[PDB]
Design a protein around this ligand. Structure first.
Ligand SMILES: CCCCCCCC/C=C\CCCCCCCC(=O)OC[C@H](O)CO
Ligand SMILES: CCCCCCCC/C=C\CCCCCCCC(=O)OC[C@H](O)CO
Ligand SMILES: CCCCCCCC/C=C\CCCCCCCC(=O)OC[C@H](O)CO
Ligand SMILES: *C\C=C(C)/C=C/C=C(C)/C=C/C1=C(C)CCCC1(C)C
Ligand SMILES: CCCCCCCC/C=C\CCCCCCCC(=O)O
Ligand SMILES: CCCCCCCC/C=C\CCCCCCCC(=O)O
Ligand SMILES: CCCCCCCC/C=C\CCCCCCCC(=O)O
Ligand SMILES: CCCCCCCC/C=C\CCCCCCCC(=O)O
Length: 265
């Protein structure tokens, strides 16, 4: 895989290399710092919603582990020789992010449906179609990015197929939110709508980063993609998580859960 990604084609300046490393390790720090928040505030969440704030904990450690794995793979593969960082061992590839997305995406979607007050047979059927489209988007994307060096034309077609799964996924999410936000308590019917647009923005940064090999095949493009991945990660995972927690707590309080009522005090 390492030879299939453009990162393997370049020598990096000390600044370039250490900006990538600092990006990944700061991402580890943000995800593990928020995990403690999600854990501590789960006691303020009513029983019917607490799983949502538990799913953020799982998303945090999952993303933190892979990002930490990426950072160590990054510094294992390259060595400073003759004024630049040069590849020594093929041990780095963005493929593991696609495995991070494969597990974290189901979690992110499931916490949304829970705070939407879906239950029963609709919760299981909607989650099933959503996860299935999501995995289809990830797998087709994963196969695409194997060609970002050799076959750009092939990366664009796998991207078009993945985008089809993306669009159908956003349509289900969107429809369920707008048809169910009347069920939301504590005024969260206005908050879930701002979560939907956060999703649209943050999740669209990934396809843009995905196409970096086509409009910026050079070491600077490598740095840009990692930057875009960082902004998208913190947005789609952390900030999104915080808002799902706020909704969880506010609906808990409005539902008669004293810890939520008193925590917001
Ligand atoms: C030979 C090549 C084969 C290429 C073919 C692969 C591409 C299929 C793409 C989209 C399928 C979407 C089908 C539409 C069904 C979606 C299910 C649905 O609508 O569920 C959401 C609903 O809101 C909850 O009940
Ligand atoms: C390979 C490229 C293929 C071509 C791609 C072109 C299609 C893109 C169009 C829309 C994106 C999906 C946007 C989904 C936004 C949410 C929809 C929604 O929420 O529906 C509102 C509902 O109807 C209220 O009651
Ligand atoms: C590098 C450091 C990055 C740190 C990473 C961010 C960690 C979260 C920080 C503040 C939460 C602000 C958002 C609060 C969301 C609302 C929660 C709520 O409803 O209030 C509960 C109250 O905090 C219970 O006493
Ligand atoms: C870390 C959390 C999330 C939700 C990551 C989401 C990733 C995507 C929405 C990626 C989408 C892609 C598409 C639409 C087409 C090109 C290949 C990608 C997989 C990057
Ligand atoms: C309260 C606890 C918050 C701790 C924040 C993160 C601690 C992890 C330590 C190190 C950060 C990344 C190390 C990876 C090398
Ligand atoms: C083959 C792919 C099928 C994937 C199936 C996974 C769908 C899971 C759907 C929802 C499971 C319920 C999650 C938590 C319910 C909340 C219960 C509680 O509040 O204690
Ligand atoms: C279903 C998606 C099919 C996309 C296959 C693209 C063909 C690329 C190739 O193998 O030559
Ligand atoms: C993520 C959305 C994907 C959208 C893809 C757009 C559809 C493809 C558009 C034009 C293809 C351009 C053909 C050029 C062949 C490139 C071969 C090369 O020189 O490397």
């Amino acid at each position: 895989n390492s030879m299939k990604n453009i990162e393997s084609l370049f020598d990096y300046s000390a600044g370039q290399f250490e900006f990538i490393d600092h990006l990944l390790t700061m991402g580890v720090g943000v995800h593990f710092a928020a995990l403690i928040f999600f854990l501590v505030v789960s006691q303020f969440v009513a029983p019917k919603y607490r799983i949502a704030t538990a799913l953020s904990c799982i998303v945090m450690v999952s993303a933190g582990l892979i990002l930490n794995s990426q950072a160590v793979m990054w510094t294992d593969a390259y060595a400073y020789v003759d004024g630049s960082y040069q590849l020594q061992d093929l041990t780095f590839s963005n493929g593991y992010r696609y495995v991070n997305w494969m597990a974290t995406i189901p979690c992110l979607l499931l916490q949304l449906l829970i705070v939407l007050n879906l239950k029963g047979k609709e919760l299981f059927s909607t989650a099933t179609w959503l996860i299935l489209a999501a995995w289809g988007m990830i797998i087709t994307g994963y196969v695409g990015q194997l060609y970002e060096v050799d076959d750009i034309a092939q990366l664009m077609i796998w991207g078009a197929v993945s985008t089809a799964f993306f669009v159908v996924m956003n349509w289900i999410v969107g429809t369920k939110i707008f048809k169910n936000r009347a069920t939301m308590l504590g005024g969260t019917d206005s908050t879930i709508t701002k979560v939907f647009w956060l999703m649209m923005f943050a999740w669209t940064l990934y396809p843009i980063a995905y196409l970096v090999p086509a409009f910026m095949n050079n070491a600077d493009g490598v740095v840009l993609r990692q930057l875009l991945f960082t902004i998208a990660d913190i947005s789609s995972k952390v900030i999104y998580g915080l808002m799902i927690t706020y909704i969880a707590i506010q609906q808990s309080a409005a539902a008669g859960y004293v810890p939520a009522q008193q925590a917001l005090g």
